[PDB]
């Protein structure tokens, strides 16, 4: 919705959104949104997202599909309605995006994921790019397994010519709700296949939002198909303005910068990892 | 499906990914792979790809085309629902690629083909590209037979200038369907019309993955038709992603380099091949 | 079809290829699937060629057109299923190209069309190129009348401002089907307003495929219609490409070279002509 401000009220929300990087328990966004999630009342659409065609799909609090959801609206506070109708599995009125509230005025954050290393990790859209063979597919997993944590991390695999791998967009847009449904830590290999359909466009430009207001992490190794030239910066420009956080990699072996914005409005945030490979190219993050 | 890690199952998909390629018995997958088709249930769909308009054709398991099936539902184990239809001979319901779990929590491998002149070589797509008219139709031959080994290989042949060859898209990837359900080495000769509609796009999307889940290998002569330019960047680089393995003329003559993925996030290998001329253009790729 | 080989049926196959273009008796090819195509039942589909809308045209073997013609399915020796329908027409079933078998086992051969001057000549499609006023008109026609010999060359007019030149694309379609399936030699003058509309794409995919399956030649005028920049490598290697046989004007007077491809992996001929303007613009290719 629209929300109003004067000088005070915006130092509030301001505030807030700091706090909601640098002070708030990592995880704690997710935990909350989980439990939003969870009181539901079933049946009840929470999520949609662009199929190829540009229709949405709807999913339930299970991850189960809606396909048939007779219209029910909603009155916010600025006086808008917000309409949900599902007809033949596919949304007839309502919008892209969480179809229930999840912040509740508490807008324009980056919500902490996870802490590892000394450095807070923020929720969101984080995108992995760089030179050819940077060593990508790797460095999403072990920041999958460490931005885990305690949890074990989610792998959506999309579009590359190896075994098991769905290469049908729909069928991914799917795995990536029920990612972001389920889990607070995501990995996306990857989306070389994305950068287009409506449902593609609708996707880089829906995700990073729909998973910071679930204070989840969504980790996808990007890659220009082509050009070791100055399209590295295209593809890492298009990164730059759909993503939370950018992960690039240096001229150094295993070294990697990550580019963080911690919320609205606020300071980004750099700092580096240092990597090594043991068996079967399982990569190390650097840390104590 | 969408598959959940923790450092200890993540270093064990990894071993697992790595033995696929390196130590597995070369062509075992593919058996396993048939054994599964074999028993799936009469009239079960197994395959759907993409025909020129990008609506799907389906198949069973005897690369027979299946033009009418009532829905049915599956349920992974990841709670995802798989649902099949079809309808005057197209999907109405599914996704392009496999149908039926090939690979279960195994996925992101290379699994290996064959084994010839001292080289492992990976299941999925091989694209064979290099400079104007490099001697491309010979190799994929040669190769084809090498890594049949004890097998015949299956030739597709598509859109040149040349006595009984098919120039229709929709005969062709019904070709390709039928190729990769019977024979564990197939050849197409060309690529070359596909590089595009809906259904080219998708073919050059799919086709790696739907070969490397099933075992087989498909060797694909490229090439682009105008330029010695820097267009062997525009055709290649769209072969070095959607390809499994590449190989590329070198400046030497009859010499190749072979560039292999031999899993998901593993190592990419790297061997030559040097070949020479017989009676009637058959080519010999030399070994000991 | 897709074919089978191993190394001992490949050596056949090759061996078969190269016959059928060095030692076969020239025309012998066209002059076999025209008794294939006698004896196909009365009122039956035997090609298909696209119309403008990228929708297909059928004819049955004596040229004529059919308008409608009851579902019929056909098994080929490798289980693929062939179904011709056509309605108000239209082919509602089926694919672009041959409809009957021509070619059998017998694929990727360049059959020999005639030979004159101690050249052999390849059926399938001869794009005649270059400069811009090199005298392509001329050239067309006097090969035309050396190839055809003893029999009448067949002449397709297409696009030019001149009199009783066709103008419209699927007349002319019509016109190189009727050619194709009744002589042996057709020049087609021009093809530059076909250089895009999904016919005009389809035709250029076809034809070389057709011509070469039927053992005709389709001499073609080409010409870029603009620009003389790099356009004319542009062209001569978008030539290269969908064409049996290339010619090509030199930078001396009256003289052309002809780039034949003998057949599939085979080794592609060069070979010079010298020609000579009489009356009228009459051309004579110079032999002995
Ligand atoms: N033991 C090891 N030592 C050094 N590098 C290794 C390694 N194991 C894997 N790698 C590197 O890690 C890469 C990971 O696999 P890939 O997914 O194939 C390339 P990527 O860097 O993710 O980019 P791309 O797939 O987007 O092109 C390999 O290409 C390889 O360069
Ligand atoms: N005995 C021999 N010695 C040397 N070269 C030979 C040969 N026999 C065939 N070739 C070459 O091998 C090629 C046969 O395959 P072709 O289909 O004609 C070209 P290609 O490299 O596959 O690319 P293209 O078809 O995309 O142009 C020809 O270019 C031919 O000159
Ligand atoms: N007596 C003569 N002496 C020399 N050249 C002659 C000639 N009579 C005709 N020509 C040549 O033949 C051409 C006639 O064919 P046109 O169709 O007019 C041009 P083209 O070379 O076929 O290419 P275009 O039609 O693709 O532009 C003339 O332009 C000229 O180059
Ligand atoms: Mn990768
Ligand atoms: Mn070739
Ligand atoms: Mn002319």
Same mark, same amino acid.
């Given at each position: 919705?629209?929300? !109003?401000?004067? =000088?005070?009220?915006? @130092? ?5 959104? &700091? #706090? ?5 328990? $990592? ?111 790797? !460095?999403?997993? =072990?920041?999958?397994? @460490? ?5 074990? &991390? #989610? ?5 590359? $010519? ?127």
């Amino acid at each position: 919705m629209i929300h !109003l401000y004067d =000088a005070k009220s915006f @130092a509030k929300l301001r505030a807030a959104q &700091y #706090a909601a990087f640098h002070t708030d328990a $990592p995880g704690s966004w997710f935990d909350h949104t989980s439990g939003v999630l969870e009181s539901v009342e079933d049946g009840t659409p929470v999520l949609a997202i662009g199929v190829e065609s540009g229709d949405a799909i709807v999913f339930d609090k299970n991850a189960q599909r809606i396909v048939a959801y007779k219209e029910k609206s909603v009155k916010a506070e600025d006086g808008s309605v917000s309409v949900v109708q599902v007809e033949n599995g596919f949304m007839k009125q309502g919008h892209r995006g969480w179809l229930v509230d999840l912040t509740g005025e508490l807008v324009g954050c980056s919500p902490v994921v996870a802490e590892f290393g000394g450095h807070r990790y923020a929720s969101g859209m984080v995108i992995v790019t760089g030179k050819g063979n940077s060593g990508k597919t790797p !460095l999403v997993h =072990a920041l999958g397994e @460490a931005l885990g944590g305690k949890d074990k &991390y #989610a792998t959506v695999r999309f579009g590359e $010519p190896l075994s098991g791998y769905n290469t049908d967009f729909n069928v991914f847009v799917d795995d990536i709700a029920r990612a972001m449904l389920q889990h607070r830590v995501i990995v996306i290999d990857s989306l070389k296949n994305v950068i287009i359909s409506r449902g593609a466009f609708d996707l880089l430009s829906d995700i990073g939002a729909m998973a910071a207001s679930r204070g989840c992490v969504v980790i996808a190794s990007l890659g220009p198909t082509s050009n070791d030239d100055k399209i590295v910066e295209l593809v890492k420009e298009a990164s730059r303005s759909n993503s939370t956080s950018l992960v690039i990699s240096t001229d150094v072996d295993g070294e990697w910068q990550v580019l963080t914005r911690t919320g609205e409005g606020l300071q980004r945030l750099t700092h580096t990892l240092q990597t090594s490979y043991g068996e079967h190219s399982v990569l190390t993050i650097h840390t104590s």
